[PDB]
Design a binder for this molecule. Structure first.
Ligand SMILES: NC(=O)C1=CN([C@@H]2O[C@H](COP(=O)(O)OP(=O)(O)OC[C@H]3O[C@@H](n4cnc5c(N)ncnc54)[C@H](OP(=O)(O)O)[C@@H]3O)[C@@H](O)[C@H]2O)C=CC1
Ligand SMILES: NC(=O)C1=CN([C@@H]2O[C@H](COP(=O)(O)OP(=O)(O)OC[C@H]3O[C@@H](n4cnc5c(N)ncnc54)[C@H](OP(=O)(O)O)[C@@H]3O)[C@@H](O)[C@H]2O)C=CC1
Lengths: 193, 193
């Protein structure tokens, strides 16, 4: 089971052009929104989270309860959390593609012989790095996308391609949740199959 | 410039189910069709061809005039052509993704220090391995897809996902060529932007 779990904020540039804010430095364009974080935890519960190196680095520390697999260039130093934590498993892009495309891979701890099997029965959530998300979409069983809307502009250093959201909209939407976070913020979490 | 150049044959299984034949062992489901091979050469002319390991192995020898880049697991032996030829450059999936997603990578010859730059101005054709094709589609500038139709069933060991062809059909078709190859064979080459 492969689930995509990500968020974005449709916003405007200083000149009024549209853009889909995805990342802001080592954080999020909309900052820290309680409901957003709560939804994330519920959606990733009981799954093995897969993310890119910068996504792992953006974490203040390991998220409790879930295994963190990081896809990165192993020829470089291991990426760590803001608190210095290492991931449970680090895999190459080749392993990542072999897995999401329907294969099975063996993952091993970073500084230990321990290794286990990640196959098509494993429950996985792909969360960070548009590259990882775009690569997994054709093989995903479920897509959980959140749209955070702010009254005023939000900045970003990483954006999402509108074509990506378009490809997702082709899928069957089966669930949608809308929340008035505050006077200038709304959050919509939608589930596609 | 990223161009996808691939072919398939919409056929039926022994029980009448539909399937998109893509590969047959180390060859093609429809065998060797002159026009198909001629089209391939014209479409890959002046470009750097990128393919997976088995695709490289399916080649009787290096295709004259074009650089062959093979994306594979470098922890394994170098894949060679049916004639024993090595590719001009071998890169990892990480390098492949970094490139197609908009980056720049440095490629080096297999058994020599030589290395060069592959960037967004390079002219590339992604041809073999559905995994490579699915990964490049969201970043492609052009898609050249050929549909070979045989009167009678063709076998295959590798197939294409109908969703892939569906995603392509969303693009603007700008060219289409249909040929009556023979009494039981037709070939349609279509170009999407
Ligand atoms: N749902 C959401 O909205 C989410 C947003 N984010 C946000 O995403 C942004 C990060 O996006 P993005 O960069 O695409 O993320 P990825 O995790 O996809 O990519 C991380 C990058 O870091 C580099 N890298 C590769 N290997 C290593 C290594 N071993 N050590 C250190 N660095 C390495 C590479 O650099 P290079 O580019 O040079 O090849 C790679 O492109 C952040 O702002 C984060 O807050 C994160 C999760 C979810
Ligand atoms: N347009 C078309 O219709 C085209 C069709 N083809 C056909 O495609 C078929 C091959 O498809 P596919 O297998 O998806 O192709 P790819 O080239 O995508 O994959 C080759 C595979 O070979 C393995 N491999 C990885 N690294 C190495 C290595 N270093 N040495 C040896 N093997 C390695 C892997 O095995 P593993 O699965 O174990 O991870 C990988 O999955 C063929 O039948 C070919 O004729 C080829 C080009 C074009």
């Amino acid at each position: 089971m492969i689930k995509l779990v990500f968020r974005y904020s449709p916003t405007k540039t200083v000149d009024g052009f549209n853009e889909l804010a995805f990342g802001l430095g080592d954080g999020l364009p909309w900052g820290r929104v309680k409901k957003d974080l709560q939804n994330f935890k519920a959606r990733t519960e009981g799954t093995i989270m897969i993310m890119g190196a910068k996504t792992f680095q953006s974490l203040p520390t390991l998220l409790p309860g879930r295994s963190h697999i990081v896809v990165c260039d192993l020829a470089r130093d291991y990426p760590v959390t803001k608190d210095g934590d290492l991931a449970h498993f680090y895999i190459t892009w080749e392993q990542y593609i072999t897995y999401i495309s329907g294969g099975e891979i063996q993952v091993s701890s970073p500084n230990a012989p321990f290794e286990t099997m990640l196959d098509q029965n494993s429950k996985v959530s792909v969360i960070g790095g548009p590259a990882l998300l775009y690569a997994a979409l054709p093989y995903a069983d479920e897509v959980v996308v959140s749209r955070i809307v702010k009254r005023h502009r939000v900045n970003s250093t990483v954006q999402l391609d509108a074509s990506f959201l378009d490809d997702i909209s082709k899928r069957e939407m089966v669930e949608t949740h809308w929340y008035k976070i505050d006077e200038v913020t709304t959050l919509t979490e939608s589930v596609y199959k």
